Paper text:
Maintaining the optimal nucleotide balance required for normal cell proliferation is controlled by 5′-nucleotidases amongst other processes. These enzymes catalyze the dephosphorylation of ribo- and deoxyribonucleoside monophosphates to their corresponding nucleosides, and also exhibit, in certain cases phosphotransferase activity. All structures adopt a tetrameric assembly displaying a cross-like shape, in agreement with the quaternary solution structure. Each subunit consists of four domains: an “N-Terminal Regulatory Domain” (NTRD, M1 to K59), an “OD” (D60 to T143), a HAD-like Catalytic Domain (CD, F144 to K270 and K371 to Q444) and a C2 cap domain13 (K271 to N370).
Residue numbers in the entry:
A (entry chain D): 60 to 315, 327 to 361, 364 to 399, 402 to 444
B (entry chain C): 11 to 21, 25 to 39, 42 to 45, 52 to 176, 181 to 317, 327 to 444
C (entry chain A): 15 to 48, 51 to 176, 180 to 196, 198 to 275, 277 to 317, 326 to 430, 434 to 444
D (entry chain B): 59 to 177, 181 to 318, 327 to 400, 404 to 431, 434 to 442
The structure:
Amino acid sequence: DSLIMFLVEIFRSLFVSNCIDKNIDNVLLSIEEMFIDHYYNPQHSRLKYLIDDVGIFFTKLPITKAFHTYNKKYRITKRLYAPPTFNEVRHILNLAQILSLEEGLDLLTFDADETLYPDGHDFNDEVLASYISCLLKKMNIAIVTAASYNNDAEKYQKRLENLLKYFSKHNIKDGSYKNFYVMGGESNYLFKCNEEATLYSVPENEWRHYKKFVDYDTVQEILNISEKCLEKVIKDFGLCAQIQRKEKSIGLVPNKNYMIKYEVLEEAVIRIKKEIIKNKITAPYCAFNGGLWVDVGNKAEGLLILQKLLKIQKKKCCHIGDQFLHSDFPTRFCSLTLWVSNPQETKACLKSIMHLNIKSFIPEVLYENQ
Amino acid sequence: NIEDIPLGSSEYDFFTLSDRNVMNSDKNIVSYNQLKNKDSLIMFLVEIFRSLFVSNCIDKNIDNVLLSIEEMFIDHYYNPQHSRLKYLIDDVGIFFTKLPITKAFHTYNKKYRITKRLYAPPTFNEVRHILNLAQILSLEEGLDLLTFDADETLYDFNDEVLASYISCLLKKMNIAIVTAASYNNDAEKYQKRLENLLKYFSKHNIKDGSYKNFYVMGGESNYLFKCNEEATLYSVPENEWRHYKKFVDYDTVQEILNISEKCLEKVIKDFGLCAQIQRKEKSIGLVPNKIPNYMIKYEVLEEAVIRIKKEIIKNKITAPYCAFNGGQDLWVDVGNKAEGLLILQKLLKIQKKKCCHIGDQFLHSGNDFPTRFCSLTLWVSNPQETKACLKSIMHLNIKSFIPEVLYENQ
Amino acid sequence: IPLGSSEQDPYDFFTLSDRNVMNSDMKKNIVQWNYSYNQLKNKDSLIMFLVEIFRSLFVSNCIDKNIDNVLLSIEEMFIDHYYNPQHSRLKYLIDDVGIFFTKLPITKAFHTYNKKYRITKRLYAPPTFNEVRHILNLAQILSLEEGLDLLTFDADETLYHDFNDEVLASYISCLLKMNIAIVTAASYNNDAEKYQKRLENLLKYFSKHNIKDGSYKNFYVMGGESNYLFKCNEEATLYSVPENEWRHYKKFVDYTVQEILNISEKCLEKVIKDFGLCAQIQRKEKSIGLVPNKIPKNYMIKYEVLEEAVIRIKKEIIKNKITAPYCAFNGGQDLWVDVGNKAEGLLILQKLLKIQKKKCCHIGDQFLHSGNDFPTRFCSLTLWVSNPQETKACLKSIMHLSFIPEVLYENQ
Amino acid sequence: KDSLIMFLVEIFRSLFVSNCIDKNIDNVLLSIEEMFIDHYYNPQHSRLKYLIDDVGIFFTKLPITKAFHTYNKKYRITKRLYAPPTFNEVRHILNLAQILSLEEGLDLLTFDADETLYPDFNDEVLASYISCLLKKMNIAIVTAASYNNDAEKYQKRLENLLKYFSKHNIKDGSYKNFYVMGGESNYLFKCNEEATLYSVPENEWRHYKKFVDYDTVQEILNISEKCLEKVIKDFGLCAQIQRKEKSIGLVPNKIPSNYMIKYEVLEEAVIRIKKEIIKNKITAPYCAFNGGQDLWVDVGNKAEGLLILQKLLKIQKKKCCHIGDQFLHSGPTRFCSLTLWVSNPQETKACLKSIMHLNSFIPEVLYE
């Protein structure tokens, strides 16, 4: 809600000034030169001054070609009473990031909790599985999830079986199955795929040196502080819920199920962080309300581990998620992040990613089949 | 009559909260001015509880604050035009009953203990619950008519526990269904949408005379239907209830659709939409084509509504209508669900303190359906809330039952 | 004219109009810089509408380059609103914008202000509300290629106690050689001499410079907002213009006038008893006021109590169903309800002199009055000046209507 | 108190729109006073600190409930049906609670001269109160005007106040308790038997001040001088750069018979200065101030000077009270001593009259 709101008001002022359908190249190219200036000198840039929480530009964002591409198809400037909206600027920034990938991509990462199964149940989309299939032939595919199953690959495969079903038919002969990765526990458990389209655990020895270290005792007392507070949350609000503890995660689960108020869940999240602050713990963790789980580790550092493990340059990486569902350390600080809000947008970006170096193909981020 | 209800049939959310293609699931994360204009009475109470919370007194004795609010509510019930509440909030509505807002808060606070929170103040959704509680607690003498907004709270129908509650309440009061769907006077198509509800009526509502209390208002306020002993819908002739409705000349109805048709044809050209226009007897719509369905941008559909409203003002038309979106298509109806409610209580000769409407104000504008003007309204956002409110209505007068507006089994 | 004599503006917890607390020019601009967006937007919606446009151009880092395409598009809307004030696109975006009696060259006004003060060279301070108040004042002055026949001043806001500025008495004098009108809420019946005492040093200047060429006849004074008219004679002395002479240009209000005074008096008597005020009520033929008593100086009435009393009187006016035009103001230390309207007093002066509205200009400070009482740009072109330095700058530009118009600094 | 005043403004607004503020609101007020008392005991872990981050520290227990009753009984703002409490009335109530918390009196009373004493000093009734208060406490005046060691230049501004001391505060030796701190926190002065200012040697009080070396003080002025030099050329100013040893200023030139700089340019230049210093990794407390017509960046701050006079005169923080105007410097002294926010001379004399009667007199902070 920083860079998007930045352009939204700019377009709102061009709208009410009655010039947004005319030649706004002078305004667009000044913003683009701002973005190019920020890409070269990201510290003490002019964009940094206006938007202090702005990330790092790993690419040169062609925001002028992104607006012209979106406006030629959807004619948002021909609307007399409806200015450009939050979602249209978001589509334009997704359009600019895809257009900036002239070199191509070697690693494409997904947020499964938001992109592959936002419903909360196993993968289920053949067309989406087909896009991931053909993209796996050209690049590495990694999937990041907050599921807490420790290191048993059968539980993670249960959620992605419909996706691994498609790998069985087309992704075994050419050896592309070797490049598919799964990071469980946000950033603590890694899995790969074999010839039989089955997930197997990658031992820590093969990738532990790519993850920043956190003390075992530090991990535990994070869960200890989280445990006592949830116990008080149960007694304070008379909840019919139970605490489920794992090696690096602890959760507030309702008994089979019972409904916990969304506000009480948010209240519990604010008691946890505030308590961890009072004990002067500096280790990164992720207290998450799903409509509660406290994982030691976040999905952003999990994207970092995968970039080091595969030895990929920041330019050739792109992450796909839905920032509506979390409001968190932004994953945009570690990779190029597309923001998709429904499956039709996800299949639109994946189709344009399949045609990156092709000039005849126009980038689309909203309608897969239009 | 609809002349007394402030309709704004022809009168911006940069975040597009009402866009359900992007707002796909339970909404909770995201909105101040948007929630305020949907109901200024809720946000009026949200700001008062927030100050009591930040003054560190919301879990102590706040009866002094609640009772002065309740007295303002009682006074607004007695003189709704010159009351203090009418001055602080201008678009409140009419309190057809005295609202016991204090006991409604104690009831919600005793079960959910929202004042025990240290960091989350009472939210907009919780005050809406407390309001629904006050509306139900005010029904001390019962209900004679219960209206449902089918498009917002019922839809086809597929909920056996919901059908059972309606059947149980059908034995005690008139049940009316108001839908924006228009299938002319053919009750077959309306029967297909309410089939599982009518099939339940066949089993439990035929022997007693309860099936005679079921009404269906199609076309928002244009096509009325009743239920026979075979649990089958049949048209109530227009001549039977036409005098309960503000008369709109047939020449005015067609001209409204003619204005809407030419605006929509221009919207098709301006944006290259793969859509066509299907025209009904009293309604007209912009419908996306089927891909050899297509998609029209949510912002283009919102642009088309405003153009249609602005062109109707240019043509000096004061007839009530409802130009609205609906996610995927555009629809202009020469009809109004608020007048549809007024027709029903005039036909049934119901006094206003014995009527209750159930709808989801998130999915409609306050210009089309103004808040608290036809009857007392319940704002529900999910079926579990609907089931909880119906069971609470089912257990009126039953002192053993504590009214619940959020959780059915809890 | 969309008058809201009994309506009220949104409440201001910051009390910007409280002159006792906001008594420094340094205090005002700091609070203007922060706690002020809602009040400034209500004082003039077209200025704040332009502030947000430049703020977006500034933040996009293009305000230093060629922004003519934005400025000329804004100017086209001002021309279309001048040609169709009822259903202009500008009317849709700004409901309370008002009437443009002239074609405003807003592009040429921005250039003129920017080339002298270089507000565009700033990197951290975008254009402010007061600078887009200045560019618009310049746009209205540049719009008078066909000049002015009448120039009106709000003496309560722009000239004064009594008139005391000979340099300001120099500008009006040579301007008097066009019609000059003085509008004042001060009510002294048809007593021509009591109005003289407050314009004493202005009229004494007229005696030395405006008698020979006969310019003294074109000077007018509207007293009681719109109740008592005065002219100037050969001896620089005000004399009463009989009400019979001009009353047909004014909306007739039934001698209804007395009932407004009875309503306000009874409300102010309750106000005194409610807050234990050491004040009395003074009643004139067409006005009534709450004045504090003398200290056995004079006592002090709270600004908020004066605010409460104003709202009460206007609500009591509504419940009595009186729709006659009037003005109840706060006045800082004393309250006054007058059966008259300065905006109506301007229309009388325009009708009395039969002058086109394109040839009329008004000088006043909108910080000191409400828009429901004097609507924006509905009687004539209006210049919003904040201190005598801006008044002399604007008057000097009107004099030389080689000269580059200046509205901010008299010398510079 | 900008954050604390709006805290109560918003709470009294809800009591207004709930129709209960004229009724008995003792439960709401004493719930607030309990939060204030808990903050006085544990300021770092208080509920109030979570609500207001910049609340600071309360050196006294605030009787905000008694302050509300006192203000409302005389002015009856709860009888207003349409004008809820304003920012100023809560500010008046916050001044009442602080004066009411001084049960044991004051040993030091401090004045910001630029904000509350300069309408040169010309007010006899104000000079009469200061003379009376000097007979029972230490009176300190803090000024941003820096004339270095030269006491004759400072005395010009306080002449009519010092000449009032000459006729009343000399026989009892009250002049020995009058102090002047020029340069914000750099030049201390005292008064002698002739009602005349004399400078105090810095060696005698420098140990009460955090030390900044000639190397650091000068670099503040070097960066400011070059940023101000760019500003004069950027906007074509007819102004000069006046450099002193501990301050440097942008001063407009006089007219041929002074010129005026746009307030936005003076604000544009302060921001350029501050952001350039941060680029140079300087963390020393300086004060870049706008002041309407001329810019001044002084090495030092008025708050540091209040701490200097506290340690020098051996004054407990409960016995200190500062009088200033925070409308003029909202770009805080509340962290060093009890601070009253006054906006006009009548408020100053009202608050001062209440301080003379700290030990039947109902406190007043509005009209004397």
